[PDB]
Amino acid sequence: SNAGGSSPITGLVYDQRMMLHHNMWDSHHPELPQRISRIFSRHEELRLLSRCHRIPARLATEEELALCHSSKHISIIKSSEHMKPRDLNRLGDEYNSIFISNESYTCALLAAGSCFNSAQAILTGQVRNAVAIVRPPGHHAEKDTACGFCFFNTAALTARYAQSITRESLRVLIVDWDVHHGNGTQHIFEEDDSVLYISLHRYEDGAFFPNSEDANYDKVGLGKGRGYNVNIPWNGGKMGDPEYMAAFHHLVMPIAREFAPELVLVSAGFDAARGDPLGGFQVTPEGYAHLTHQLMSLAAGRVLIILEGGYNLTSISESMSMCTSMLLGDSPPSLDHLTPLKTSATVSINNVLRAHAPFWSSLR
Ligand SMILES: O=C(NO)c1cnc(NC2(c3ccccc3)CCC(F)(F)CC2)nc1
Ligand SMILES: [K+]
Ligand SMILES: [K+]
Ligand SMILES: [Zn+2]
């Protein structure tokens, strides 16, 4: 029972089977199997694992995938399960930045099913919040195609899965703090006012992957979805804790509170972390802890943290373990001295404010 209340529980999902997805031609490709085992091992080292309720992985079904993806796309990825290597190579090469092994399809299904089980546990009160240590990632995957190490859009599917077991209009916030724009998530929800998508990402006037002006601040959503897509694009600066904290203070949290989400999904890539070989930014583990802590003030604390990217194995292990520590209710660690904001970060924050003040009274 929870008569009289009870201490909130944090769920954790991790299944070593998701390590089987691998790059048979470049075994040093940074989207490594041991991304998830290293993160899991750090949770054991820090004694966080035994404090969590372990949530089992499961496979997503093909009908669950159709919540966001076309039958053609599902069928093509499914067909890779039985391909020979030369045909896996050719099929991967048809996409932007995709490698495929015979286990990729099953691993993508497990990453999605793990997050469905976690959202289910949160929404039915089995746990208050959860962390999902999953791969391959999701947020670059589109309705019709794979992209950027992602086959199916785990976070987008989880938002639709949540609506499917509560009510169609359940308000879901997705905060995407992966250093890359989540092009797939933006596109899936661009006309939808029930899912608010807020992405922070390195942009560089369109030069940074995925190299599209869709990631710019002026893309605010379409139709009913106008105002429900918030891009915070970083240009010309080595961004870190001061800039992300300022973005949360001026943009993410005011908009999120006004939206009043009923569930928060974090597309939690850690490739903006200090030390990441791809992102080039310097968010610290303590910074990620503070971002997590702020999001826990939303949705009565119903937050699911979903691993996306992040490629320095030590950085992502420490950063995601910080986030779990915050979900468990530990007191936030001290931030380093916040250097004054990079001046271009103020420019970006002010551009987003101008783009979104028409839709959010909290910004006016
Ligand atoms: O998921 C991600 N990060 O979290 C992610 C990161 N990099 C790529 N692609 C790029 C990449 C691919 C393999 C190894 C390093 C980088 C290749 C094309 C590029 F040069 F344009 C950008 C980098 N794709 C997805
Ligand atoms: K992002
Ligand atoms: K939206
Ligand atoms: Zn990324």
Cis peptide leading into residue 136 (ω within 30°): yes
How far, in Å, CA of 12 to CA of 17, rounded? Answer: 15
Q: Tell me the three-class secondary structure of 243-270, residue by residue.
A: HHHHHHHHHHHHHHHHHCCCEEEEEECC
* Residues forming a β-bridge with 265: 174, 304
For a mutational test of ligand 1's pocket, the pick from 96, 278, 311, 319, i.e. the residue with the most ligand atoms closer than 8 A to its C-beta, is: 278
Read off φ and ψ for residue 238, nearest 5 degrees: -85, 90
Distance 186 CA to ligand 3 centre (A): 7
* Residues forming a β-bridge with 304: 130, 265
Length in residues, the chain: 364
How far, in Å, CA of 65 to CA of 175, rounded? Answer: 21
Give the other-Cβ count within 10 Å of 326's Cβ. 25
Q: How was this structure determined?
A: X-ray
> Among the atoms of ligand 1, which is closest to the Cα of residue 210?
21
Query: Which residues form the pocket of ligand 1, taking CB atoms under 6 Å from any ligand atom?
Result: 29-30, 97, 137, 140, 148-149, 178, 180, 209, 269, 271, 278, 309
Outline where DSSP puts E strands in 84-239: 129-133, 172-176, 195-202, 229-234
Q: Which residue, judged by its Cα, is nearest atom 18 of ligand 1? A: 97
Distance 268 CA to ligand 4 centre (A): 9
How far, in Å, CA of 215 to CA of 188, rounded? Answer: 14
For a mutational test of ligand 1's pocket, the pick from 25, 134, 209, i.e. the residue with the most ligand atoms closer than 8 A to its C-beta, is: 209
How far, in Å, CA of 187 to CA of 42, rounded? Answer: 34
Please state, in angstroms and as integers, the Cα–Cα distance from residue 185 to each residue in 107, 191, 269, 321, following that order.
Answer: 20, 11, 14, 25
Looking at this protein, which amino acid is placed at residue 65? Answer: L
Q: Phi/psi class of residue 42: alpha, beta or left (left: φ > 0; alpha: ψ in -120 to 50)?
A: alpha
For the chain, the straight-line distance linking the first and the last C-alpha, in angstroms and rounded, comes to 44
Do 285 and 318 contact (CB within 8 A), yes or no? yes
Do 6 and 126 contact (CB within 8 A), yes or no? no
User: Which residue ranges form the domains of the chain, and what is each CATH number?
Assistant: 1-364 (3.40.800.20)
